[PDB]
Design an enzyme around this catalytic site. Structure first.
Site, PDB file in Angstrom:
ATOM      1  N   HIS B 119      -7.221  78.033  56.271  1.00  0.00           N
ATOM      2  CA  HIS B 119      -8.043  78.360  57.449  1.00  0.00           C
ATOM      3  C   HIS B 119      -7.511  77.668  58.760  1.00  0.00           C
ATOM      4  O   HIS B 119      -8.294  77.349  59.669  1.00  0.00           O
ATOM      5  CB  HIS B 119      -9.524  78.033  57.194  1.00  0.00           C
ATOM      6  N   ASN B 192     -17.437  82.462  53.911  1.00  0.00           N
ATOM      7  CA  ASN B 192     -16.433  83.497  54.121  1.00  0.00           C
ATOM      8  C   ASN B 192     -17.099  84.823  54.475  1.00  0.00           C
ATOM      9  O   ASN B 192     -18.327  84.903  54.486  1.00  0.00           O
ATOM     10  CB  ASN B 192     -15.512  83.629  52.892  1.00  0.00           C
ATOM     11  N   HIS B 383     -17.708  70.688  56.290  1.00  0.00           N
ATOM     12  CA  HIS B 383     -17.678  70.247  54.915  1.00  0.00           C
ATOM     13  C   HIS B 383     -18.943  70.762  54.205  1.00  0.00           C
ATOM     14  O   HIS B 383     -20.058  70.445  54.637  1.00  0.00           O
ATOM     15  CB  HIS B 383     -17.602  68.698  54.908  1.00  0.00           C
ATOM     16  N   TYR B 406     -12.988  68.312  50.938  1.00  0.00           N
ATOM     17  CA  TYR B 406     -13.168  68.253  52.381  1.00  0.00           C
ATOM     18  C   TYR B 406     -13.100  66.869  52.993  1.00  0.00           C
ATOM     19  O   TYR B 406     -12.400  66.694  53.997  1.00  0.00           O
ATOM     20  CB  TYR B 406     -14.385  69.042  52.841  1.00  0.00           C
TER      21      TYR B 406
HETATM   22  C1  HEM Z   1     -16.604  79.661  48.045  1.00  0.00           C
HETATM   23  C2  HEM Z   1     -15.299  79.414  48.231  1.00  0.00           C
HETATM   24  C3  HEM Z   1     -14.785  78.819  49.506  1.00  0.00           C
HETATM   25  C4  HEM Z   1     -15.144  79.089  50.757  1.00  0.00           C
HETATM   26  C5  HEM Z   1     -16.132  80.120  51.318  1.00  0.00           C
HETATM   27  C6  HEM Z   1     -14.351  78.186  51.619  1.00  0.00           C
HETATM   28  C7  HEM Z   1     -14.364  78.348  53.012  1.00  0.00           C
HETATM   29  C8  HEM Z   1     -13.597  77.566  53.904  1.00  0.00           C
HETATM   30  C9  HEM Z   1     -13.583  77.673  55.332  1.00  0.00           C
HETATM   31  C10 HEM Z   1     -14.340  78.622  56.251  1.00  0.00           C
HETATM   32  C11 HEM Z   1     -12.830  76.668  55.801  1.00  0.00           C
HETATM   33  C12 HEM Z   1     -12.488  76.395  57.237  1.00  0.00           C
HETATM   34  C13 HEM Z   1     -13.525  75.492  58.003  1.00  0.00           C
HETATM   35  C14 HEM Z   1     -12.964  75.365  59.370  1.00  0.00           C
HETATM   36  O1  HEM Z   1     -13.103  76.447  60.229  1.00  0.00           O
HETATM   37  O2  HEM Z   1     -12.379  74.294  59.673  1.00  0.00           O
HETATM   38  C15 HEM Z   1     -12.244  76.006  54.660  1.00  0.00           C
HETATM   39  C16 HEM Z   1     -11.473  74.900  54.804  1.00  0.00           C
HETATM   40  C17 HEM Z   1     -10.949  74.218  53.734  1.00  0.00           C
HETATM   41  N1  HEM Z   1     -11.279  74.421  52.452  1.00  0.00           N
HETATM   42 FE1  HEM Z   1     -12.616  75.745  51.711  1.00  0.00          FE
HETATM   43  N2  HEM Z   1     -13.619  77.311  50.927  1.00  0.00           N
HETATM   44  C18 HEM Z   1     -13.783  77.636  49.633  1.00  0.00           C
HETATM   45  C19 HEM Z   1     -13.164  76.989  48.586  1.00  0.00           C
HETATM   46  C20 HEM Z   1     -12.373  75.895  48.698  1.00  0.00           C
HETATM   47  C21 HEM Z   1     -11.925  75.114  47.573  1.00  0.00           C
HETATM   48  C22 HEM Z   1     -12.205  75.456  46.116  1.00  0.00           C
HETATM   49  C23 HEM Z   1     -11.311  73.998  48.095  1.00  0.00           C
HETATM   50  C24 HEM Z   1     -10.627  72.908  47.395  1.00  0.00           C
HETATM   51  C25 HEM Z   1     -10.983  72.493  46.202  1.00  0.00           C
HETATM   52  C26 HEM Z   1     -11.286  74.130  49.479  1.00  0.00           C
HETATM   53  C27 HEM Z   1     -10.547  73.293  50.341  1.00  0.00           C
HETATM   54  C28 HEM Z   1     -10.580  73.497  51.738  1.00  0.00           C
HETATM   55  C29 HEM Z   1      -9.874  72.559  52.642  1.00  0.00           C
HETATM   56  C30 HEM Z   1      -9.107  71.340  52.123  1.00  0.00           C
HETATM   57  C31 HEM Z   1     -10.089  72.964  53.873  1.00  0.00           C
HETATM   58  C32 HEM Z   1      -9.609  72.358  55.176  1.00  0.00           C
HETATM   59  C33 HEM Z   1     -10.848  71.548  55.688  1.00  0.00           C
HETATM   60  C34 HEM Z   1     -10.440  70.715  56.919  1.00  0.00           C
HETATM   61  O3  HEM Z   1      -9.136  70.415  57.039  1.00  0.00           O
HETATM   62  O4  HEM Z   1     -11.278  70.398  57.793  1.00  0.00           O
HETATM   63  N3  HEM Z   1     -12.026  75.230  49.929  1.00  0.00           N
HETATM   64  N4  HEM Z   1     -12.807  76.510  53.460  1.00  0.00           N
END
Ligand code: HEM
Ligand code: HEM
Lengths: 735, 744
Positions: B119, B192, B383, B406
């Site tokens: 993202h 999402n 987060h 996060y």
């Molecule tokens: C239901 C499933 C998921 C959804 C809807 C989701 C949604 C998102 C979204 C929208 C962001 C971006 C937030 C922003 O605009 O900064 C994001 C960031 C991220 N997601 Fe998820 N995610 C999912 C699953 C996962 C999983 C399973 C992991 C890891 C185990 C994960 C790790 C991350 C990381 C590391 C970031 C970057 C956060 C940051 O650097 O601030 N995500 N996710």
């Protein structure tokens, strides 16, 4: 539910079609692969030295970073099937922690880049002019790592943008690392390094909304240009087709700054570095390049990788413009002014050696992303000058590399390591790899008998000593009056262009300024163009609905550059240098292809090292008139004309593709983009879609069958790159 | 008119350039709502200073002005010359003692921070949330307790795969993250634009991401799943099929962030004051309705405008066309946990609206752009672990792993544990604890104690017991019974019924677009066996889908594949029309844009009628020509040109109107004809008045005309009503059989 359990074991197809052949293959014939698996026999001293950090995978157990074998890599540890994940799952946490920390800061500028391994070899010893070891012996092979780049865009931006291109070469010399960090234009936008953040901030996305990516076509860039005429010279280059190269293999390279060469007697000679492409100079046209950022944002990165995989090694001749110390003030321009070029008509480029890029990296992040180039990385036999832009760059690169690469030990990252010995009293720092056994970490010392020791300067294997240039002046923050000329070099460049290149410069400025929201900025830029050339200024003004004042029409043109009005070496196309090896042709198939045409087309293309991509309305196969099974590389929509250099339509069942919108558009786009088109037999019916009369025209190859004469005609057109004579006809074409 | 540059000589290389703004003040945008392209875009606090909320007001202490201030170093030292380095003579070497140069270059050298792992490409805005009524019966969450409680929000929309510098209109899932600045803590709803995710367990997240991301050897392709490793993973992991179906549909190419849905994906819990847990799934319903691009248009638009969505979001806010979304809840009682064919804790499964309706809970309005993209957008940290009392998690194995990720990623991305002190991330409510130090610590703690229990500060700050309001956080006492295992629940082992339900819920044109999505992507897969393995998976979903994809790939299905028994219906449903973008009409015209193709002598009566009708519906217009500047209408009216035909392509508009006048001026213009051909191919409404009807020949439309092409002797009442009705329906789906013959 087996997909959610350990283990799935053997998943490769029985036929072994998952594995690419470890031999040279044309683009798209095999899946691309890490360099050491694709070409294991391609080697040099640097590639060989990287073997100690190369990690395999075949026949090895999946483990944690601590070497613990993993039994189940499909599931987190939980209290029951449907229970909460437990804090004690160290396997999940290590895997997620590493993933969470994969990204490092991108480069402040030149964030978007593509790199390759290769070697440099000089033609003869240059001991008379330089004591640089890598230029001392014609049999001395120096391994290289080259990174090509755009400037403005992020690491995830598109390749075929309108921008300056970086051309950075790391020479792994027996006397230290020498980095030649240049661009694809012989001049820079600014004079003093103090202005670098101002210029970069202006060209980069605007701070409120972070728009636009990979584009100078916005208010702040043109605002800066309008108020800083020193930028006009590089802007002229960026607005020309130079700003949209066909490939990294078809652009020139320049160090920009005047440096010094130092010989064994201590004599200094002023030098300007050049890279001359063996493939010649070739560029896209604006509409094609912009649309290509959409159809394939990885076009240049892909073309570089695939040319190396095919054995079409990018080759560049290293060249020097040499000026004796006594000739420092003999020119109308200051040699230390990076906004000024040295015309080849005044000081010729002496060919010094050749560089061949023959191997791709294994891992893009580890080798390309982590590579650190710094123009401050010189070796004995080379030195700097007082160029105020180069002076500031010397500080910048070391400083930025500390935060980007996480500390002062970035030279220990495998790609950055010298192949020659390195020993000093420097210690510690984040991620220190080297384990020092020296009882002393200082000098002078008696405890280790003063080792490692200083080496006096000498003819070879000597210590670095700066040229004892005489410095006289007061401590001032002041631009040299000699730098205060901004219009003659842009005029020299403009008049060196062909009429069609001149039209492309006009269109470049017109398109960019049309994207500037504040009209007064457009008007101020047009006013600057009027100080360069009135024809240029009027043509841009007309496209912008701007009327030049009587005063503007009366602006005295700037003078010649040491008597030169023009220099044909400044044009991409004035002097022919077009090579066909490595180029690509789209072949538009039908359901019953005339095999005789296809056999003749492919045989002639192969003889010149010209690649082909067999296209159709779907994937799979088509059967020729004689029963030959033809594999389809891509669809018409899948690999658009934008991605090829020419289009060939063989005969057969033309009715199958005659009413296909995609087939007709494929030809119309290639036509608009000035590409050679060849039509055999019933394929000549496609002339109607491109509005070409029955008698035909130059640039459209046509015959009853694809044979000897037909293919020679098409290949001659491909050697000329594009059909410039077609320009007056494209305006009526809806494409 | 005729503005001349103030700099032509060496004064350009000297201090004292002074006033450089034009005398007419045309450099400054109006601080009032203006349509897209009317004024230069500007920082939010300068464009809309009267638009405010609790969070925007709290950021005032860190806002830095510029007007009438001296240029200084970061230490407050006034700079005399910002054009030159300090050197020994005017042509001498730069001196190490130039502290001004070194500070300016050092800061520049250190501007970049790591982008988000996923993202990385995203666009954000400020706004507010307000609930319709108190939800105290189901949740004790303070932000949902009173209809008059306004909660400031920060929302970031994003793609998934691409870098921060990648394109907007790629085929991908979109992120929709909302930071709620509640009186009882920050709540982040991190969702999402699809109701499900690709995978079941967080342990697989790096495997899936590595497969979709650019391939490790060469770092290709950017912003695309159309490559071998992605389809290899999908072919070997059927749990991915459901989200793949959504990505392959027009859901994967939204028209705007305003025209997509939002979902939390996971089942969470709502906790009331009595301790009762209700299962909940979060939804965002767009006021602008659901609208998507077509593949060819989306792909070409990544080229013509890679910043299309970011731009459209910023400009809609500057125009006052505020993105609005209804917060919705699918509520399931604890006793109904096992009532469905699918596991509620399975993130690859959706809850059909036909089984559990979406209850409208409140509305969110995005009404102000940030001032600085880096400071507010790039540095924002969302987060899903950021919950408040009244909310709780579930055992969803994907959500469980997200809780760890996060916080961990934010430490390296944002340079330490004090990222909550970055202004955008700060809570607006009080925060006090015993945590200390860490890189870039802003807060200066005066507490004599940095531990608890303590007597030296009479144990302050103190724990707060859980309660109906302003109480401490306590987890729902869920009963846990099971052995310590790395095992997927057998209940999650169903992969085909949800992709089939989605498929059957689509219109025939949406189904054709899914087939084309899979066909195009798989055509880009080099290894043919991967394509065959994906087609084999499609045969377990729907035979019509698999056959159509196979035909486009030159693949023949085996007799065994044709005999694959379809997966069962989902709790009796064969289809759910809420899964389609277009089945139920929800199209609004406000905020849409129309290209108006001008000529050198435009019929002013047509243009007056066109603009009056567009304004009445909040539809924007862009006046286009073959050059910039102005054109003069038949009555003498001076018309300003917004862009050229090449400058603002049909890809950037919703409809095309060609008024009458001197048609011969543009009749043979390749760009003018291509504009109409591209808009035609892309199924956009086209309106032709008077002699402009001669353009029907370029689009191969017969004299009698056809549905989707508005035509009359003049642009008037009936003409504009016809075009606006076509715009309300988004695209002319009935035109699909005609587009294939069009060379565009
Ligand atoms: C239901 C499933 C998921 C959804 C809807 C989701 C949604 C998102 C979204 C929208 C962001 C971006 C937030 C922003 O605009 O900064 C994001 C960031 C991220 N997601 Fe998820 N995610 C999912 C699953 C996962 C999983 C399973 C992991 C890891 C185990 C994960 C790790 C991350 C990381 C590391 C970031 C970057 C956060 C940051 O650097 O601030 N995500 N996710
Ligand atoms: C003659 C004018 C210039 C040329 C030819 C030039 C060329 C380049 C090239 C090709 C790169 C990328 C090397 C790579 O592939 O990683 C680059 C990186 C960079 N340049 Fe320059 N540059 C110029 C002027 C400047 C100036 C004046 C400064 C600042 C005072 C500067 C600061 C940087 C920085 C900070 C980077 C990123 C380095 C890194 O992260 O490893 N450059 N430059």
């Amino acid at each position: 539910s087996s997909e959610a359990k350990p283990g799935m074991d053997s998943l490769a197809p029985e036929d072994g079609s998952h594995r690419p052949a470890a031999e040279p293959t044309p683009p798209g014939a095999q899946p691309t692969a890490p360099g050491s698996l694709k070409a294991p026999d391609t080697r040099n001293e640097k590639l060989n030295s990287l073997e100690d950090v190369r990690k395999g995978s075949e026949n090895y157990a999946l483990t944690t970073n601590q070497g613990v074998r993993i039994a189940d890599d499909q599931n987190s540890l939980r209290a029951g099937s449907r229970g909460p994940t437990l804090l004690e799952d160290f396997i999940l946490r290590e895997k997620i922690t590493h993933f969470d920390h994969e990204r490092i800061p991108e480069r402040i500028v030149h964030a978007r880049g593509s790199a390759a391994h290769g070697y440099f070899q000089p033609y003869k010893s240059l001991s008379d002019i330089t004591k640089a070891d890598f230029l001392s012996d014609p049999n001395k092979i120096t391994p290289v790592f080259v990174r090509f780049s755009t400037v403005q865009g992020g690491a995830g931006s598109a390749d075929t943008v309108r921008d300056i291109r970086g051309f950075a070469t790391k020479f792994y010399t027996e006397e230290g690392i020498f980095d030649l960090v240049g661009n694809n234009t012989p001049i820079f936008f600014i004079q003093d390094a103090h202005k670098f953040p101002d210029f970069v901030h202006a060209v980069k996305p605007e701070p409120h909304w972070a728009i636009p990516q990979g584009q100078s076509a916005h208010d702040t860039f043109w605002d800066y240009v309008s108020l800083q005429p020193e930028t006009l010279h590089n802007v002229m280059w960026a607005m020309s087709d130079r700003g949209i190269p066909r490939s990294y293999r078809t652009m020139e390279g320049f160090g920009i700054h005047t440096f010094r060469l130092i010989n064994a007697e201590g004599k200094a000679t002023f030098v300007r570095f050049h890279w001359k492409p063996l493939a010649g100079k070739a560029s896209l046209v604006w509409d094609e390049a912009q649309k290509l950022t959409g159809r394939d944002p990885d076009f240049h990165r892909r073309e570089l990788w695939e040319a190396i995989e095919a054995g079409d090694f990018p080759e560049y001749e290293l060249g020097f413009q040499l000026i004796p110390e006594e000739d420092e003030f003999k020119f109308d321009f200051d040699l230390l002014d990076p906004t000024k070029l040295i015309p080849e008509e005044l000081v010729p480029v002496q060919r010094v050696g050749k560089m061949v890029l023959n191997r791709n990296p294994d891992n893009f992040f580890a080798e390309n992303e982590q590579a650190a180039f710094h123009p401050g990385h010189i070796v004995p036999g080379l030195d700097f000058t007082n160029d105020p832009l180069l002076q500031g760059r010397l500080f910048s690169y070391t400083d930025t590399q500390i935060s980007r690469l996480g500390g002062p030990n970035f030279h220990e990252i495998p790609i950055n390591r010298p192949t020659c010995p390195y020993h000093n009293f420097q210690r510690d720092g984040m991620h220190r790899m080297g384990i020092d056994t020296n009882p002393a970490n200082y000098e002078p010392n008696s405890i280790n008998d003063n080792w490692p020791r200083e080496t006096p300067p000498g003819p070879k294997r000597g210590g670095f000593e700066s040229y004892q240039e005489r410095v006289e002046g007061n401590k001032v923050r002041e631009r040299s009056p000699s730098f205060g000329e901004y219009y003659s070099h842009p005029r020299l460049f403009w008049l060196s262009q062909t009429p069609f290149e001149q039209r492309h410069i006009v269109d470049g400025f017109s398109f960019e300024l049309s994207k500037v929201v504040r009209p007064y900025i457009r008007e101020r830029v047009v006013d600057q163009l009027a100080h360069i050339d009135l024809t240029l200024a009027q043509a841009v003004a007309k496209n912008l609905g701007i009327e030049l004042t009587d005063d503007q029409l009366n602006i005295t043109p700037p003078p010649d550059v040491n008597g030169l009005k023009k220099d044909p070496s400044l044009s991409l196309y004035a002097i022919p240098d077009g090579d066909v090896k490595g180029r690509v042709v789209a072949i538009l198939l039908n359901d019953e292809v005339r095999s005789a045409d296809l056999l003749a087309i492919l045989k002639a293309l192969k003889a010149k090292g010209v690649h082909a991509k067999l296209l159709y309305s779907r994937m799979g196969e088509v059967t020729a008139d004689d029963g030959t099974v033809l594999p389809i590389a891509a669809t018409f929509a899948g690999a658009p004309s934008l991605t090829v250099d020419a289009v060939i339509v063989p005969c057969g069942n033309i009715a199958d593709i005659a009413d296909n919108g995609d087939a007709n558009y494929y030809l119309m786009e290639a036509y608009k983009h000035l590409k050679p088109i060849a039509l055999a037999g019933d394929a000549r019916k496609f002339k109607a879609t491109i509005k070409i009369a029955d008698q035909g025209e130059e640039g459209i190859v046509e015959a009853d069958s694809a044979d000897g004469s037909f293919m020679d005609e098409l290949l001659t057109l491909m050697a000329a790159h594009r059909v410039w004579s077609r320009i007056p006809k494209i305006d009526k074409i809806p494409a």
